[PDB]
DNA sequence: GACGCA
């Protein structure tokens, strides 16, 4: 669906198959509150090769898992610092969950 | 602004 934003977004793309191995994960910070899950998938699928987006309940953060590094880096370049549906995003390479 | 609710 159309996103309320003045950012020029690519068209929606198919997600990657669910069992595709992750090649890059993004860390997302929301201000002032998180976006709905279906809206987040809408935004992040447009860069291609999206596996899934998920949220951390009770916090203003989420993650986006990509099957392709170029797609994930395009999401960073296009979305970091922008306002989508009234929410300012920070989008960056995530720290690994473990050593 | 940090590790996937009820």
Author numbering: 369 to 467
What did the original publication write about this model?
Its dysfunction and aggregation are associated with neurodegenerative diseases such as amyotrophic lateral sclerosis (ALS) and frontotemporal lobar dementia (FTLD).
There are also four RBM45RRM3 molecules per asymmetric unit, however, the space group and the packing pattern of the complex crystal are totally different from those of the protein-alone crystal. Superimposition with the protein-alone structure shows that the C-terminal loop of RBM45RRM3 in the complex structure is in a different direction. This loop is directly involved in the interaction with ssDNA, suggesting that the conformational change is most likely a result of ssDNA binding. The purine ring of A2 π–π stacks with the aromatic side chain of Phe395; the N1 and N3 of A2 form hydrogen bonds with the main-chain amino group of Asp463 in the C-terminal loop and the side-chain hydroxyl group of Tyr431 in β3, respectively; the N6 forms a hydrogen bond with the main-chain carbonyl group of Leu461 via a water molecule. The hydroxyl group of Tyr431 contacts the pyrimidine ring of C3 through OH–π interaction; two side-chain amino groups of Arg393 in β1 form hydrogen bonds with O2 and N3 of C3; the main-chain carbonyl group of Asp463 forms a hydrogen bond with N4 of C3. For G4, its purine ring π–π stacks with the side chain of Tyr422, whereas its N1 and N2 form two hydrogen bonds with the side-chain carboxyl group of Glu420 in β2 and its O6 forms a hydrogen bond with the side-chain amino group of Lys433 in β3.
